[PDB]
Design a binder for this molecule. Structure first.
Ligand SMILES: [Cl-]
Ligand SMILES: [Cl-]
Length: 329
């Protein structure tokens, strides 16, 4: 079976209580301590509000969970607790539930974000480098803690642009990496699904997040959102194969002893690899450098084992100036 290149044994060496989220005994706080103020966003599994702690008067984020199995809620809480206070990770403060409806809410430290549909079209070259580097800090940290996010996308990256603060949010799809485990492939969101999810390679690992990051990065530097625009999970692989080419897909399927369903094989067809330079135009040229292309190229590989790790990405020349600005302090 496939195994992670890095952080392979993190959860083998940690005690069972670290990763056994199903056994979690949730310590419920006071539902009355937090009041909603205004709605911030919506999702398939929750609605997110700006709130206030009525005692301290501090602002918070209140995430009200739609009905889901207890095991899934315990998974998100356990992971949030295990990552609490890590770099650029959203910070869980409290867990409460309504005593009549039993609906649970997760309480987070407040983040004053700007929606990516407004922010990304105004991001400069340096800000793309800065924010992707900040996101890589979050991914290297959570991966080092034995956790895959499995839903990296612009909506789950809250950026406070005036403070230049970034938080990786919504850990409701995240899982613990266990070497040798076959995971559910119905994770992430369509446009950011790695080829492993689309070809039924279940023994995937942290590198799934690095594919999703590459999709985000491509969307930013080419001003093409989303970059891989599929209309369903099968079409999503078609859109990928029309860019990366089918030769390396076929090699990938052979290496892992996979074959496409005949219905999917007909859709994928045969395609040459398209050079990244084909996506440059006058409107986005100021964001595309040789270094940006090389970095993107090393993220978007069919073979998850060939993708940069978060640490390798941070070391790429594309971030040279960001690292220097950070080193100076
Ligand atoms: Cl799952
Ligand atoms: Cl990594």
């Amino acid at each position: 079976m496939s195994k992670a290149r890095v952080y392979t044994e993190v959860n083998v060496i940690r005690p069972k209580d670290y990763w056994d989220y199903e056994s979690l005994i949730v310590q419920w706080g006071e539902q009355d301590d937090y009041e909603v103020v205004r709605k911030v966003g919506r999702g398939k599994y929750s609605e997110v509000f700006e709130g206030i702690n009525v005692n301290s008067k501090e602002k918070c984020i209140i995430k009200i969970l739609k009905p889901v199995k207890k095991k899934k809620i315990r998974r998100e809480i356990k992971i949030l607790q295990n990552l609490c206070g890590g770099p650029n990770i959203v910070k869980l403060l409290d867990v409460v539930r309504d005593q009549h409806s039993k609906t649970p809410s997760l309480i987070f430290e407040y983040v004053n974000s700007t929606d990516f549909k407004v922010l990304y079209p105004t991001l400069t070259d340096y800000d793309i480098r800065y924010y992707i580097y900040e996101l890589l800090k979050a991914l290297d940290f959570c991966h080092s803690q034995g956790i895959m996010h499995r839903d990296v996308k612009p909506h789950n990256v809250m950026i406070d642009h005036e403070l230049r603060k970034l938080r990786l949010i919504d850990w409701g799809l995240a899982e613990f990496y266990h070497p040798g485990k076959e995971y559910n492939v119905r994770v992430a969101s369509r446009y950011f699904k790695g080829p492993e999810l689309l070809v039924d390679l279940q023994d995937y690992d942290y590198s799934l997040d690095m594919w999703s990051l590459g999709c985000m990065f491509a969307g930013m530097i080419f001003r093409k959102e989303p970059f891989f625009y599929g209309h369903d999970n099968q079409d999503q692989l078609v859109k990928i194969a029309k860019v990366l080419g089918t030769d390396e897909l076929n090699a990938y399927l052979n290496k892992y002893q996979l074959e496409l369903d005949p219905q999917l094989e007909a859709l994928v067809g045969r395609h040459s690899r398209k050079p990244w330079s084909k996506f440059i135009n006058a409107d986005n040229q100021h964001l595309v450098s040789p270094e940006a292309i090389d970095f993107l190229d090393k993220l978007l590989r069919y073979d998850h084992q060939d993708r940069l790790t978060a640490k390798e990405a941070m070391a790429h020349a594309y971030f040279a100036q960001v690292r220097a600005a950070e080193t100076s302090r």
